[PDB]
UniProtKB/TrEMBL annotation, chain D:
Protein role: Accessory subunit of the mitochondrial membrane respiratory chain NADH dehydrogenase (Complex I), that is believed not to be involved in catalysis. Complex I functions in the transfer of electrons from NADH to the respiratory chain. The immediate electron acceptor for the enzyme is believed to be ubiquinone.
UniProt family annotation: Belongs to the complex I NDUFA1 subunit family.
Section covered of the full-length record: 92 to 161 of 161
Residues annotated as transmembrane: 1-18
Intracellular or extracellular location(s): Mitochondrion inner membrane
Complex and partners: Complex I is composed of 45 different subunits.
Protein name per its UniProtKB record: NADH dehydrogenase [ubiquinone] 1 alpha subcomplex subunit 1
Species in which this protein is naturally found: Sus scrofa (Pig)
Coiled coil: none
UniProtKB/TrEMBL annotation, chain F:
Positions of region (Disordered): 55-83
Assembly notes: Complex I is composed of 45 different subunits.
Record field: transmembrane: 17-37
Any matching Pfam family: NADHdh_A3
Keywords carried by this UniProt record: Acetylation, Electron transport, Membrane, Mitochondrion, Mitochondrion inner membrane, Respiratory chain, Transmembrane, Transmembrane helix, Transport
Function statement: Accessory subunit of the mitochondrial membrane respiratory chain NADH dehydrogenase (Complex I), that is believed not to be involved in catalysis. Complex I functions in the transfer of electrons from NADH to the respiratory chain. The immediate electron acceptor for the enzyme is believed to be ubiquinone.
Membrane topology of this protein: Single-pass membrane protein
Protein name, entry field: NADH dehydrogenase [ubiquinone] 1 alpha subcomplex subunit 3
TrEMBL record, chain G:
GO biological process entries: aerobic respiration; mitochondrial electron transport, NADH to ubiquinone; mitochondrial respiratory chain complex I assembly
Keywords noted in UniProt: Electron transport, Membrane, Mitochondrion, NAD, Respiratory chain, Translocase, Transmembrane, Transmembrane helix, Transport, Ubiquinone
Gene designation per UniProt: MT-ND1
GO CC annotation terms, alphabetical: mitochondrial inner membrane; respiratory chain complex I
Top EC class for this record: translocase
Name the record gives this protein: NADH-ubiquinone oxidoreductase chain 1
InterPro entries named among the record's database cross-references: NADH_UbQ_OxRdtase_su1/FPO, NADH_UbQ_OxRdtase_su1_CS
Reaction(s) the record says it catalyses: a ubiquinone + NADH + 5 H(+)(in) = a ubiquinol + NAD(+) + 4 H(+)(out)
Claim: Cytoplasm is one of the keywords in the record: no
Gene source species: Sus scrofa
Entry similarity comment: Belongs to the complex I subunit 1 family.
Domain of life from the UniProt record: Eukaryota
GO terms of molecular function: NADH dehydrogenase (ubiquinone) activity
UniProtKB/TrEMBL annotation, chain H:
Entry similarity comment: Belongs to the complex I NDUFA8 subunit family.
Subunit structure: Complex I is composed of 45 different subunits.
Disulfide bonds listed in the record: 45-55, 77-109, 87-99
Classification of source organism: Eukaryota, Metazoa, Chordata, Craniata, Vertebrata
Residues of the full protein shown: 78 to 191 of 248
UniProt-annotated location(s): Mitochondrion intermembrane space
Protein name per the record: NADH dehydrogenase [ubiquinone] 1 alpha subcomplex subunit 8
Summary of the function given for this chain in its UniProt record: Accessory subunit of the mitochondrial membrane respiratory chain NADH dehydrogenase (Complex I), that is believed not to be involved in catalysis. Complex I functions in the transfer of electrons from NADH to the respiratory chain. The immediate electron acceptor for the enzyme is believed to be ubiquinone.
Length: 115, 99, 347, 70, 175, 83, 318, 114, 98
């Protein structure tokens, strides 16, 4: 009820904002106005060619990092258990392993940029 | 298991979750704990082959508890009946079902 | 792959596989597969050639998809039963849904496509790991669920595997492709007896494992991947190609060698189950296997082949490599027929 | 002279003040003067239904004391 | 109406599921997945799995984010595909949207159905159960048991991510 | 000794961040065992009742459990009230 | 009347986002020996409205090479998240009280990047792709600790509900107990919003305007609110997270005045930082965080899980 | 597969405690101490018989004792309870924290009167 | 079986059809690879919430944690599909046909 009402209201207001923005101002298009911006001169011509960025290795590791942040999120409810001895050991395992994965990721180059 | 070590060295790695009638955090019962309690102690150490025939009329009672298959069939039949005389207008719901 | 990490590269493959035999929970059985899968990829690219990356990827989509189907077969069974224990499935489609997936894990049905393809790019050592170890995990699941597998399902997919597997072998000249089709046919041999008795599939699995072990041992020792390069090996090492022949005879299953006992025991058990036409059909089709074994033997030791002169340089040196256990597997996989009653130990 | 900065944040100070002011008063107005009930658990939600059923007017924020019972 | 709101939320999950499975341009499929993922959060959120919905939402945004970076990095073409431009994806698109249309009609019209399984369409609201959770949420408390009951699951999972960084470096080493 | 102390000093100079993380990270593993309140922490968690203390039938020979939730006999937690 | 509440949480924010622009101009100017806008009305108080009308009546440029459908979704997606991520904030009594408030905080914060992502792609240019991919690089380093700092600080609060944050901070400020985390959270909140030392994605001197290069009029005007409404909301998030003020149960006025003042003080520091420091490099940013920040997070999170158990100070769940 | 047995309408008739949430919570502590014998026997039967239909009469007994406890709280300490339950009611979570002062008056009232 | 379980099950069905029925982009295929995780995750979450299976409530995230691992190594297969072949389209990798 309330949550999607809040969600619906927000997208509606945004839609009107772009609607009056994109319609009202008395457009005048003459092709070169719509031409791509290339810092004053013409584009060399591409912008969809494969932009080979050099942080590929750090990219996937972030995915693996997030997969285990979801694992360590139930800690606030995990602390309210009757077996903190087991819960503390297994909890510290994740951070030790996460540091260990980063440590290998760090020491064997990894984090460093590709040049 | 293929090579049973959980039994051999005597340590539980995955049995605790295998069923829904096992002990749960803060004794939160499952939906069909009564049925899984009865079914499990029905066919225990009697034999998998000697289970599907004798622990049957108790097993589907559990499988109905999970899915409510023929129970939902009952509601669909009743609600289908409602549509076929409300339009025909023989019967009106009692005020208990209005307010 | 760095030596120290190359060890744990293989360690999680073994333990990831070992998780499949020892677990009793379906999710754990599921978990054991990607731990096998995710760590199996890098060793396939240990050499890291464009063919290796080619070989690894076709494995990944084939294997990841098969594990993906594996997941729902658990879920539909869970939805219709509510148990995770490794027992019979309680819903027929989930059963067939699993058997379809585990085959792609195994290369039984037309899925067998991926098996010869990946074997070429991945090295001989990687192949030694692939056709031997990567089959233990799916077999363990099938043996456990053998109670409620559709007999006409497993038999059909087993029959085809020995059919295409034997038949596709009669085109290849690269030993790795020939070897994979041989493994594909043997994949069918164990899986045909799977519903009737599961002791025999272990027995044929064992004989297949040691023979394929000893087989690749010889291939690494000969350091050849093409029949011509293998044809040369009569000169440098005649002992290697001499035993190359004998284990090639165990391939075909020709008695009194070891390779007969898998085919022998399976036919016996199947005939006890009144299936006589089916064992007879695979018995004939196994001759196709033996045929490209004979041609492979023919270019190996029966007939001498043109060598070179720079190979007399090789006579001065020898193999500084060993890997232990080749002498044991030749003996165990050639002379073991007088010990058929030991199969009851598996029981 | 830095005072000129203040008129800017002054209206802004009121601007962020309206939401918290609005929600608190709207909750106070709709829910019978009392602060809006919080249902973070089924027990609270089950408690809220009982109040609504016994209210008669189908409104949780209508609490009847001992005068309701004998 | 909001009475079959879950019936709706289930659908646009699959229209988005269809849209990206029609194999459009890789980032366009990324949009096609996230709409399904976003609405997919809604279905499980409706059933009570608040934590499950938020986590499948949270990390799959993170998962899809890294996908986009790779798509434009070394997986994009100088003439990108659209759901309409290529006829192959257009054929895949149109086939997906009539496949659900003809079926959800059939399921809703007859409410008994036969395909694969038997399905009483009736209403997903029906199978909710008269249960009280007390002062604890089952969907969150059960997950909290991971660190007290699932030590083996923690070990196997945690270990696997560690090689997960090993493989992610092993195979990318480039000689 | 001298090498170890110098390596710490060289660390503390070259990098102050990981040494600080390693130090305070190292402590977070050890003192949980040495803490004399960790046995109290589990007691607090056990004390908090989320489910009902379901009563049990009388058959005699049960002095430990009380017959009324005010009787002196039974598990008492005045330790936690002062704690 | 719930709808009246929704507008009462949207329009008053929108004017707050509007006046942040004027305040930033004047705060930046007065930190520059300048005066800032003071001609548009009195003290320049009419300046945001002057820019307001100009942009929405400015020619909204449609680039030919741009993909139009994705072009328009990005400004909508940017603004929609900005407003809807205000709704769980516990301004005295939160508008939307949910047991998982901070998880919802992270979800739409993570959803926000797809605005600069799709817009960067749809603009179809070099500077467009450069800004969008460095926006990935800037934000890829960013969620990993943002969750950890949120987890570590909240672990002694009791749960993920935002309302109970006030009860935890009833006696002393949260910053007294986790100031090492607060500095690190503050840098990241300064960073998630692409502000001050970390504004590579915009990069005026080095990317002209980055993703915003081909975005004019309202489509630009929308992008400005999403950036600036996230500034105020993130500072408000930090204010409740670390500097939770007292809350009288009978007079919500007291908390509202105190909370708003805390947000204003924090937001000024955002402009304070924006004036002073230079701009990092997106490689150094990633190296700063995954080589120095992230290692400290794990140990600090390690400390903040061990601490409640060792001291028998675990917080109540309900 | 059988009948369903449920006691007829006249069987499940009883006047219910018509007080609201905050009233019950404020008196809950003293209600638990006083009327526990009907509570304990009712829920013990609920857990043992595992069927409400075989435990409806004990449900009647608990309501009557809840009546008598609430009847005497109105007769003697009417006003102090009224301040207590309305002050608890204002809070959005019925927290006992914001009612210590009113609780003190209620506690002493029932300490001497009842 | 309700329509919610229905429409989720049918969702994985065309996820398979998307997965194996291929196209000229390996990325779009692995997009469908992590996509079919959605159905199984959402499917699985529906039952154990419905059955009040408190223990099995961790099985979705455990399933979902392993989910992106396939994608994680899947993306790394892509990059040296690009490193050695420049592009991504799945026809240039055929040297292993022999
Ligand atoms: C998933 C659903 C995808 C539906 C679809 O076809 O999207 C096409 C849509 C438009 O592609 P484009 O690259 O902008 O090219 C548009 C013109 O071809 C090239 O630009 P244009 O300026 O020529 O566009 C105008 C053109 C095409 O119409 C539009 O561009 C209008 C917006 C899209 C309408 C469909 O108008 C017409 O053809 C006549 C319309 C009457 O591509 C998308 O990726 C949008 C998907 C939106 C999904 C829902 C998001 C919430
Ligand atoms: C018996 C089955 C196979 C029979 C046919 C073998 C192929 C035809 C014969 C020629 C084999 C190749 C050759 O050159 O053989 C001679 C070579 C040297 O003789 P060898 O004894 O191994 O070493 C010298 C000291 N004794 O020795 C060898 O190359 C190895 C001969 C192995 C003979 C079979 C052993 C089977 C396992 C016991």
């Amino acid at each position: 009820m309330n949550i999607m009402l809040t969600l619906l209201t927000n997208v509606t207001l945004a839609s009107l904002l772009v609607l009056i923005a994109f319609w009202l101002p008395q457009l005048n298009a003459y092709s070169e106005k719509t031409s791509p911006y290339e810092c004053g001169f013409d584009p060399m011509g591409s912008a969809r060619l494969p932009f080979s960025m050099k942080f590929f290795l750090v990219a996937i590791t972030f995915l693996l990092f997030d997969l285990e942040i979801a694992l360590l999120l139930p800690l606030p409810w995990a602390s309210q258990t009757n077996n903190l001895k087991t819960m503390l050991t297994m909890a510290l395992f994740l951070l030790i392993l996460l540091a260990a994965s980063l440590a290998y990721e760090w020491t064997q180059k990894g984090l460093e940029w590709a040049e | 298991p293929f090579f049973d070590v959980q039994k051999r060295l005597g340590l539980d790695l995955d049995r605790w979750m295998t069923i829904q009638s096992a002990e749960q955090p803060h004794k939160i019962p499952g939906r069909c704990h009564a049925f899984e309690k009865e079914w499990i102690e029905c066919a225990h150490g009697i034999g998998g082959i000697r289970a599907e025939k004798e622990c049957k009329i108790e097993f589907d009672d559990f499988v109905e508890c999970l899915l409510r298959q023929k129970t939902m069939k009952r509601l669909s039949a009743i609600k289908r009946q409602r549509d076929k005389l409300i339009k025909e207008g023989k019967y009106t719901p009692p005020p208990h079902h209005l307010g | 792959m760095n030596p120290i990490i190359y060890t744990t590269l293989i360690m999680t493959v073994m333990s990831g596989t070992m998780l499949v035999m020892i677990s009793s929970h379906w999710l754990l059985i599921w978990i054991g597969f990607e731990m096998n899968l995710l760590a199996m990829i890098p060793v396939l690219m240990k050499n890291f050639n464009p063919r290796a990356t080619e070989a690894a990827t076709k494995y990944f989509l084939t294997q990841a998809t098969a594990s993906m189907m594996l997941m729902m077969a658990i879920i539909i069974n869970l939805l219709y039963s509510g148990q995770w224990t490794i027992t019979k499935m309680f819903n027929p489609v989930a059963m067939t849904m699993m058997t379809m997936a585990l085959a792609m894990k195994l290369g039984l049905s037309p899925f067998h496509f991926w098996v010869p393809e990946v074997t070429q790019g991945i090295s001989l050592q990687a192949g030694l790991l692939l056709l031997t170890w990567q089959k233990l995990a799916p077999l363990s699941v099938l043996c456990q669920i053998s109670q409620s597998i559709n007999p006409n399902l497993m038999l059909t997919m087993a029959m085809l595997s020995i059919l295409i597997g034997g038949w596709g072998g009669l085109n290849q000249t690269q030993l790795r492709k020939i070897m994979a089709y041989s493994s594909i046919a043997h994949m069918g041999w164990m899986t045909a007896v799977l519903p009737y008795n599961t002791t025999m599939t272990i027995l044929n699995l064992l004989i297949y494992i040691t023979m394929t072990l000893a087989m690749f041992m010889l291939l690494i020792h000969s350091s050849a991947t093409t029949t011509l390069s293998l044809s040369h090996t009569w000169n440098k090492m005649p002992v290697i190609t001499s035993l190359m022949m004998v284990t090639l005879l165990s391939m075909g299953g020709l008695p009194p060698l070891s390779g007969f006992m898998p085919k022998w025991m399976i036919i016996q058990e199947m005939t006890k189950n009144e299936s006589i036409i089916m064992p007879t059909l695979m018995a004939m089709t196994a001759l196709l296997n033996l045929y490209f074994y004979m041609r492979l033997a023919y270019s190996s030791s029966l007939t001498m082949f043109p060598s070179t002169n720079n190979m007399k340089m090789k006579w001065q040196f020898e193999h500084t490599k060993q890997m232990k256990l080749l002498p044991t597997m030749i003996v165990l996989s050639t002379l073991v027929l007088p010990m058929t009653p030991a199969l009851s130990s598996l029981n | 002279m830095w005072f000129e900065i203040l008129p800017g944040i002054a209206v802004m100070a009121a601007c962020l003040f309206i939401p918290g002011m609005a929600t608190a008063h709207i909750h106070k107005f709709t829910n019978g003067g009392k602060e809006k009930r919080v249902a973070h658990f089924s027990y609270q939600w089950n408690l809220m239904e009982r109040d609504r059923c016994i209210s008669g007017v189908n409104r949780y924020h209508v609490t009847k004391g001992l005068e309701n019972i004998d | 109406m909001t009475m079959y709101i879950a019936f709706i939320l289930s659908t646009i999950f699959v229209i988005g599921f269809v849209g990206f499975s029609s194999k459009p341009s890789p980032i366009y499929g990324g949009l096609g997945l996230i709409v399904s993922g976003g609405v997919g959060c809604g279905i499980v959120l409706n059933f009570g799995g608040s934590f499950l919905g938020l986590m499948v939402f949270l990390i799959y945004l993170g998962g899809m984010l890294v996908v986009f970076g790779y798509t434009t990095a070394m997986a994009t073409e100088m003439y990108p595909e659209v759901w309409v431009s290529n006829k192959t994806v257009f054929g895949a698109f149109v086939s997906g949207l009539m496949m659900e249309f003809c079926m959800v009609y059939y399921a809703l019209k007859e409410e008994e159905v036969e395909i694969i399984f038997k399905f009483n369409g009736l209403g997903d609201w029906v199978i909710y159960d008269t249960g009280d959770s007390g002062f604890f949420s089952e969907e969150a408390m059960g997950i909290a048991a991971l660190y007290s009951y699932g030590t083996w699951l923690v070990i196997v999972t945690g270990w696997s991510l560690l090689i997960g960084v090993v493989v992610i470096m092993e195979i990318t080493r480039g000689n | 000794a001298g090498r170890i102390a110098s390596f710490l000093k060289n660390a503390w100079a070259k990098e102050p961040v990981l040494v600080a993380s390693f130090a305070i990270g190292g402590l977070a593993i050890i003192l949980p065992s040495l803490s004399p309140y960790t046995n109290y922490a589990i007691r607090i968690n056990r004390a908090t009742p989320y489910n009902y203390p379901v009563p049990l039938r009388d058959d005699g020979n049960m002095p430990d459990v009380p017959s009324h939730p005010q009787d002196p006999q039974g598990p008492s937690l005045e330790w936690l009230k002062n704690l | 009347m719930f709808m009246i509440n929704i507008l009462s949480l949207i329009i008053p924010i929108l004017l707050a986002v509007a006046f942040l622009t004027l305040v930033e101009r004047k705060v930046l100017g007065y930190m520059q020996l300048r005066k800032g806008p003071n001609v548009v009305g009195p003290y320049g108080l009419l300046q945001p409205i002057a820019d307001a009308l100009k942009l929405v009546t400015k020619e909204p440029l449609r680039p030919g090479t741009s993909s139009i459908s994705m072009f328009i979704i990005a400004p909508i997606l940017g603004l929609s998240l900005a407003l809807t991520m205000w709704v769980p904030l516990p301004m005295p009594y939160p508008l939307i009280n949910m047991n998982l408030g901070v998880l919802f905080m992270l979800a739409m914060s993570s959803l926000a990047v797809y605005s600069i992502l799709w817009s960067g792609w749809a603009s179809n240019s070099k500077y467009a792709l450069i800004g969008a991919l460095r926006a990935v690089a800037q934000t890829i380093s960013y969620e990993v600790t943002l969750a950890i700092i949120l987890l570590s600080v909240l672990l002694m609060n009791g749960s993920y509900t935002l309302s109970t944050l006030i009860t935890t901070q009833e006696h002393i400020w949260m910053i007294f107990t986790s100031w090492p985390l607060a500095m690190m959270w503050f840098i990241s909140t300064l960073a998630e919003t692409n502000r001050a030392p970390f504004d590579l994605t915009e990069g005026e001197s080095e990317l002209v305007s980055g993703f915003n290069v081909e975005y004019a009029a309202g489509p630009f005007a929308m992008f400005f609110m999403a950036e600036y409404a996230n500034i105020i909301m993130m500072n408000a998030f930090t204010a409740i997270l670390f500097l939770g003020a007292s809350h009288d149960p009978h007079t919500p006025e007291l908390y509202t005045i105190n909370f708003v003042l805390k947000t204003l003080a924090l937001t000024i520091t955002f402009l304070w930082i924006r004036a002073s420091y230079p701009r990092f490099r997106y490689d150094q940013l990633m190296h700063l965080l995954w080589k120095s920040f992230l290692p400290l997070t794990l140990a600090l999170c390690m400390w903040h899980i061990s601490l409640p158990i060792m001291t028998a100070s675990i917080p109540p769940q309900s | 597969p059988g009948i369903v047995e449920l006691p007829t309408l006249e069987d499940l008739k009883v006047q219910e405690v018509k007080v609201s949430s905050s009233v019950l919570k404020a008196a809950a502590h003293h209600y638990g101490a006083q009327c526990d014998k009907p509570n304990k026997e009712f829920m013990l039967c609920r857990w043992e018989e595992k069927d409400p239909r075989r435990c409806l009469e004990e449900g009647k007994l608990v309501n009557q004792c809840a009546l008598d406890f609430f009847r005497q709280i109105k007769r003697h300490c009417a006003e102090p309870f009224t301040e207590y339950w309305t002050c608890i009611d204002y809070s959005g979570l019925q927290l006992f924290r914001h009612c210590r002062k009113q609780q003190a008056k209620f506690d002493e009232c029932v300490l001497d009167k009842l | 079986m309700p329509l919610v379980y229905m429409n989720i099950i049918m969702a994985f069905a065309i996820a398979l059809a998307g997965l194996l029925m291929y196209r000229s982009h390996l990325m779009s295929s692995l997009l469908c690879l992590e996509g079919m995780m959605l159905s199984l995750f959402i499917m699985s979450t529906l039952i154990i919430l419905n059955t009040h299976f408190t223990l099995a409530n961790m099985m979705p995230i455990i399933l979902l944690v392993f989910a992106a691992c396939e994608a994680a190594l899947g993306l790394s297969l892509l990059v040296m599909v690009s490193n050695t072949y420049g592009t991504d389209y799945v026809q240039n990798l055929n040297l292993l046909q022999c």
